[PDB]
Ligand binder design. Structure first.
Ligand SMILES: [Mg+2]
Ligand SMILES: [Mg+2]
Ligand SMILES: [Mg+2]
Ligand SMILES: [Mg+2]
Lengths: 272, 287, 278, 273
């Protein structure tokens, strides 16, 4: 009888998933409808809808479930992050990449993902903020389907960078990452020992001299390159560089990056 | 374009062969696929469906009820008195489901759900008896596991022996009828007890109700009448049948009235026809 | 603290004997000061108050109506049939305002508003006649006056048709030839105390009151005297009224009700703001 | 033929110069007369106006705030990040009320309420500094009278710090005593000491001040004609410096400041502005 979630919202991207909407809904809705006696299901129609729905329902609902890929999850992130009241968020993975779902240990089988939600295991998750843009997975320069990070990793120029991190300063670089999530491009993060709930972000720079070392590092796929953890980060380049992040964005250097500890609460899989 | 921007589905979890998860697998996905704004509320107690209808009537364009006669009756009593009444649809989740049958709704719950997505809607008359609303019927003289009140009565009418008589005064559209009776029905719906109405030529959307009385003396005549399955007006002393819009029914002593579901209604009764008071999802392939 | 977390004020803009702005200057500020969640809706057409009551019944803890007998009746018909019925209060905005007077509400609208902020609440009986609810009265034989049905009747009674009536009340019967048949719930009729004696709106019972065909002159003198003490008069909970031919019934506002009638009482069906000083 | 089917009035009960009842007698009746669907919510705590704006943004067409600079700032921070942002109006209930003055709103609260009923609306720019939004200003080197009001009252009787300002692909490095980025046309209850600032021109005004004495004389002899206009600004200091803005905030350098052109629509007074 003792649920955490009196009212639930399921946001459905109809274009998400393998094919039939009906088939996808046959897999994900019945378990949710059985478990949650007040369930509201809204389809998105256009880019931005998920963001709008999150903003409208944030104060009316206790759990928001998003069925969609990285892009839809990012819309939800941007929708809830700036709000004072932020209900618990859950992901049913409906893209091909689904990075943050994997960080939470969510099964890629959508029926199982739905079933998981009904178990109501919830944990705090850190949300990053770069010049007012929020992100869950990563921030990166030098990355530029499978997605931006996925394509970069499947197929893996110099510029100077000045990074100010928690009172300390840091060269000529090829790749600069700030990681929050534990998976990137559908596989465990190539940035070592990243945690999404440890109150800190992981800076990761591949140097000018380290191009070959980095190629081998990604291949061997066993991690433990300049790498440091930090809460408050400022990243500067010689000229304005376009930044890549969880989804479509207009962000560019220079950047103040800041970590919001436990900003979201999210459904996760404690078995994994 | 859809007629229904926002939809509410009220689920009685006890409804159906009972298995919630299985039932929801059958009914929800087609609805969720068709209707991009769908709200699903489970009832917990008697009266919840009525409350939900009353809270959502002004917020929603379609209300779907998954339940048996009792839950449908709760919805009837919820929406009927309101000024704004969205369209109502039934997924039949009991064993009887009289009004669903009147609307030609398939008893296969998946197919009932699919029907709703076709959005065929018609006006339906709602009767009002002393402020109680009903869709199927009003009756006196109907009174171990239940086919429903009317269904059980029809199954045992043949082998039930000594029925009690009572006097009745019926005022119908400025005419009066007074006699000793065993059964008095006022029918709105076209099915009673799971089969076509024994009251002849009843229509739920013709702007009028059907009065149907068996005299104290007409027990045998009525048994034969049902067996004959010839639902027409026998020019029969024992059976009185007339159509009327505005009806008042009086008995010597207060008698408990039977209707679509659980109710506290009793005689005397003002019964009133509200023409096209509801709009409801129906099956034009059958009705 | 407060009984009322959320409040709705329904304003009939045509109500009051002064413009909208002046009326709102008198009634809104005290309410806004007292109630930190206040929603104000103006009616535009007949029926709106009914609709607003039905939409907000489940969202709000108090509903205040600023209007005359007609607007109050729209609220009565809006809330009465619902399962959830918040507390109702009246700011008197007509000329008659019968039920506001029953509750002891001052006719000064600023004072009526102030009263609501004191949050004195009592159960009130609501009558039900063939599914029509009423707060004040039900009557037959009441046949450009803005004084209201009863008010106009009382003003012109000085200078009628008889009809037979059969009244069944709580297992007793009364038949006779009559000129006026009233069933009273409220304590004021036509802007003055009820001519039916000792009527109470919260005593769990209704007052039947019949003026016989022989008592026309006696009744005219009785009204002139304005004595209003204990014509056939009895209290009853469950009443059935029959006439020879269908007669049109008069009640709180516009209605299509007619005899024969089952009249029934719903004890404490509403809770309402009242004035315990009066 | 109204622009506003549904209206929300957010009241700070502590706002205004006398009793709440008196204040409500002045502001509510004109609004209630003009707007047939009016919802009035009192704040109880810091943050409530922000929460109310966020809850009602999608339910309402106009949000009126009765309060000072701090309450207005709560509304700014409430609406600015949202996708759907109804029109905002100010009834000035503090002593400073800078942005209300930018919009030409009379300081007489009854007249401010009446203005709203005329429904004159214009786009207004909102600035964004590291995800904090502001309407009036951003600054380093600044009872109270408010941050700017107190600063101006005590300026008669300071520290220097290095600053790097990147503005629309140009750079400015120097040692400074005061750095302002202005959006609003009034600061500290009087016209902006930053010259020719406009809240709706699509651009922000950078204003930096060796110039301690020159600045003291400038404020005294209020002539008002390093100062430049820019849309996209980055401000860096040697060490993290606390930033001052419209109300209470945790903002600090370094800062990306961005202008969002016509981000809000707001009730204004075309007889004055
Ligand atoms: Mg981490
Ligand atoms: Mg019919
Ligand atoms: Mg009484
Ligand atoms: Mg400007």
């Amino acid at each position: 009888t003792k649920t955490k979630f009196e009212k639930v919202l399921l946001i459905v991207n109809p274009k998400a998933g393998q094919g039939d909407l009906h088939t996808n809904l046959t897999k994900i809705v019945p378990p949710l409808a059985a478990a949650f006696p007040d369930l509201h299901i809204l389809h998105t129609k256009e880019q931005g809808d998920a963001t709008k729905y999150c903003q409208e329902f944030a104060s009316k609902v206790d759990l928001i479930i998003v069925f969609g890929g990285d892009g839809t999850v990012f819309e939800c992130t941007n929708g809830l992050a700036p709000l004072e009241i932020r209900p618990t968020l859950a992901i049913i993975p409906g893209g091909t990449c689904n990075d943050f779902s994997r960080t939470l240990g969510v099964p890629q089988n959508i029926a199982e993902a739905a079933k998981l939600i009904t178990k109501e295991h919830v944990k705090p998750v850190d949300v990053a903020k770069a010049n007012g843009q929020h992100f869950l997975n990563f921030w990166g320069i030098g990355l530029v389907k499978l997605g931006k990070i996925g394509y970069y990793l499947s197929t893996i120029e110099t510029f100077p960078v000045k990074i100010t991190y928690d009172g300390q300063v840091y060269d000529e670089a090829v790749l600069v990452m700030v990681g929050n999530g534990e998976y990137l491009g559908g596989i465990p993060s190539f940035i070592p020992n990243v945690k999404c709930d440890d109150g800190t972000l992981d800076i990761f720079v591949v140097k000018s001299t380290g191009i070959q070392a980095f190629k081998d590092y990604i291949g061997k796929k066993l991690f433990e390159i300049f790498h440091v953890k930090a809460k408050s980060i400022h990243i500067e380049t010689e000229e304005e560089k376009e930044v890549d992040t969880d989804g479509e964005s207009s962000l560019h250097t220079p950047c103040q990056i800041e970590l919001l500890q436990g900003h979201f609460t999210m459904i996760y899989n404690p078995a994994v």
